[PDB]
Amino acid sequence: EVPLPQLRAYTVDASWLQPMAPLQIADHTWQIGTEDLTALLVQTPDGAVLLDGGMPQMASHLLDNMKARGVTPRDLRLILLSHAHADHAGPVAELKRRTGAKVAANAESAVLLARGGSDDLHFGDGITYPPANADRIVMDGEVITVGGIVFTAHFMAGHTPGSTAWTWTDTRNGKPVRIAYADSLSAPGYQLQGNPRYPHLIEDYRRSFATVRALPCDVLLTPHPGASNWDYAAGARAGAKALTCKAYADAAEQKFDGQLAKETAG
Numbered sequence: 001e002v003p004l005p006q007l008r009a010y011t012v013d014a015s016w017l018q019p020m021a022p023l024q025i026a027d028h029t030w031q032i033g034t035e036d037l038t039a040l041l042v043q044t045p046d047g048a049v050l051l052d053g054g055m056p057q058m059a060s061h062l063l064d065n066m067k068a069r070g071v072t073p074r075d076l077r078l079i080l081l082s083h084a085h086a087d088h089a090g091p092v093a094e095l096k097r098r099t100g101a102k103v104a105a106n107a108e109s110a111v112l113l114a115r116g117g118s119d120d121l122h123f124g125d126g127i128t129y130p131p132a133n134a135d136r137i138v139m140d141g142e143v144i145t146v147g148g149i150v151f152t153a154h155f156m157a158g159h160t161p162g163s164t165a166w167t168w169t170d171t172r173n174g175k176p177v178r179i180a181y182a183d184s185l186s187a188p189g190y191q192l193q194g195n196p197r198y199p200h201l202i203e204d205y206r207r208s209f210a211t212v213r214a215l216p217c218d219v220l221l222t223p224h225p226g227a228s229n230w231d232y233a234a235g236a237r238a239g240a241k242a243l244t245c246k247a248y249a250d251a252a253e254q255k256f257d258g259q260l261a262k263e264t265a266g
């Protein structure tokens, strides 16, 4: 006689959980997460912004890296998200408790964050994390400005209903750098065709490929750095092989078409 299985925690490659020192992207923008999960700090004369936090166990490391940059808990004003999965939104509830930060997100991301990633359209209750509340709801194309850095929301539904690309302009050498933080365009283990929980999944991904291709995009970063060919452990050469937004969208679409064909075959 056989009991119900124990709960299984989601495990990840060690590199996803490997702390790294701050890596500078542009004049006010730094990578502060791990070797394989993006967490972007944008530092301004009127406070700081964090774009994603990575996994639940990353909160204290993020705070250490902020302190190393001169950003205190009180100085962190805003958290934005690519999407509200456990591997990017994991420590948001904890960061809100330990800092001044408020969360801005679209309605879809807010609803999923408030459930802590439970009842996911594809993963069910498999990838839960501590729930958090959004403080501000944003619409597509809406701008948020901190210390004169202007963040623009570009909805790119598919990976999650609330998937968002965030764009802003920083500087390097007195010249503008148009940075695009584009969300994931994967469909890990998804049923794509005839999905009752997401009937227009395929059209949404198609529109999202087009949205990504057209972003203002001098430098592309992604929540999993490998997707845009970043190597954060490579120091001075981390971003050398980085894809354009055009090439990232094309590769994602080619992968997606292959997955659709494998699904029809299966």
Ligand SMILES: O=C(O)c1c(-c2ccccc2)nn(-c2ccccc2)c1C(=O)O
Pocket (backbone or CB within 6 Å): 010, 012, 085, 086, 087, 127, 184, 186, 187, 188, 224
């Ligand atoms: O965001 C996702 O849906 C996701 C995850 C994931 C891992 C742990 C918890 C939640 C999601 N892992 N992966 C992943 C990424 C790169 C290589 C292999 C797998 C993804 C993804 O978007 O593909």
Ligand SMILES: [Zn+2]
Pocket (backbone or CB within 6 Å): 083, 085, 159, 184
């Ligand atoms: Zn995800």
Ligand SMILES: [Zn+2]
Pocket (backbone or CB within 6 Å): 085, 087, 088, 184, 223, 224
């Ligand atoms: Zn992910």
